[PDB]
Amino acid sequence: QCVNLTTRTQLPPAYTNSFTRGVYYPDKVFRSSVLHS
Amino acid sequence: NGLTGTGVLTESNKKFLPFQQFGRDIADTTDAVRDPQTLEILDITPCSFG
Amino acid sequence: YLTPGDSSSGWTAGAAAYYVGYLQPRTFLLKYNENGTITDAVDCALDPLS
Ligand SMILES: *[C@@H]1O[C@H](CO)[C@@H](O[C@@H]2O[C@H](CO)[C@@H](O)[C@H](O)[C@H]2NC(C)=O)[C@H](O)[C@H]1NC(C)=O
Numbered sequence: 346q347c348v349n350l351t352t353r354t355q356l357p358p359a360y361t362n363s364f365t366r367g368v369y370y371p372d373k374v375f376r377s378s379v380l381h382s
Numbered sequence: 383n384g385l386t387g388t389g390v391l392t393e394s395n396k397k398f399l400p401f402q403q404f405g406r407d408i409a410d411t412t413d414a415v416r417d418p419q420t421l422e423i424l425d426i427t428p429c430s431f432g
Numbered sequence: 433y434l435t436p437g438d439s440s441s442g443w444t445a446g447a448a449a450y451y452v453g454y455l456q457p458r459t460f461l462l463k464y465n466e467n468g469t470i471t472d473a474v475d476c477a478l479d480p481l482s
């Protein structure tokens with residue numbers, strides 16, 4: 346069960362801007378009302 | 383949980399996310415902790431003052 | 433029933449989109465509100481303003 350698909354149209358790649366996306370909590374400590382570098 | 387210290391423990395209003403156990407202030411000292419048996423948050427305040 | 437094909441031309445795609453970007457080592461300045469949530473950040477190498 347393994348196929349090579351077809352009926353696919355050609356197109357160049359597309360790009361977009363990330364408006365301040367992709368930030369995560371860098372530890373498991375609780376912090377409140379602060380600015381941390 | 384192995385973290386030793388001295389101070390006064392009081393009931394807290396902070397509310398931890400499930401993956402958090404300790405809370406730290408700007409001087410990086412532990413000022414809040416989740417009790418590992420009752421799952422309640424406590425504030426730790428130093429003892430000397432004045 | 434609308435995708436005759438055989439098994440390699442009889443398929444419909446659907447609708448979805450996904451975006452990919454790559455991480456690098458940066459210094460950020462995160463802002464925690466009183467509830468402990470990160471609500472804003474500054475990328476310390478984007479501009480001279482930052
Ligand atoms: C799907 O297409 C690929 C080519 O894009 C086929 O690839 C070859 O596979 C054989 C083994 O079967 C290898 O010996 C060749 O070196 C491969 N060549 C390349 C360029 O990949 C693949 O067999 C196709 N599979 C199906 C089910 O159609």
Ligand SMILES: *[C@@H]1O[C@H](CO)[C@@H](O[C@@H]2O[C@H](CO)[C@@H](O)[C@H](O)[C@H]2NC(C)=O)[C@H](O)[C@H]1NC(C)=O
Binds near residue numbers: 419
């Ligand atoms: C840890 O064990 C203690 C008892 O050793 C449990 O405390 C009980 O908690 C329930 C609350 O649902 C009370 O009704 C009982 O009276 C408690 N027992 C005692 C002896 O105080 C505690 O629930 C245990 N930890 C967990 C996560 O269940």
Ligand SMILES: *[C@@H]1O[C@H](CO)[C@@H](O)[C@H](O)[C@H]1NC(C)=O
Binds near residue numbers: 360361
């Ligand atoms: C992303 O990089 C490609 C590389 O050629 C460029 O064509 C495109 O304009 C860039 N997009 C933005 C938003 O800068």
Ligand SMILES: *[C@@H]1O[C@H](CO)[C@@H](O)[C@H](O)[C@H]1NC(C)=O
Binds near residue numbers: 465467
């Ligand atoms: C957390 O702060 C938000 C505003 O930033 C507020 O709306 C919310 O009530 C607070 N959560 C509580 C009630 O602990």
